[PDB]
């Protein structure tokens with residue numbers, strides 16, 4: 350825990366600076382609104398990315 | 401030092417995200433090209449802002 354809290358700091362960055370890239374804004378379900386379907390590695394969508 | 405390193409993290413943010421607001425780009429000396437004469441609280445120009 351000597352510098353693990355640091356990651357959590359950076360964690361919040363991601364959402365406040367990138368969460369809108371993975372939001373569910375399309376009503377149809379297909380045709381993503383940001384024109385890119387990739388999930389940035391910063392946003393934790395699966396537990397593996399904790400690594 | 402339990403979470404003081406955190407500040408240093410945020411410290412680097414400032415420069416990489418705001419240092420250009422306090423750079424010496426004007427050649428004359430008067431006239432700030434960024435139309436801003438204010439100095440961001442993020443950047444440390446004087447030791448007091450360490451607080």
Ligand SMILES: [Ca+2]
Pocket residue numbers: 421422432434435436437438
């Ligand atoms: Ca300025």
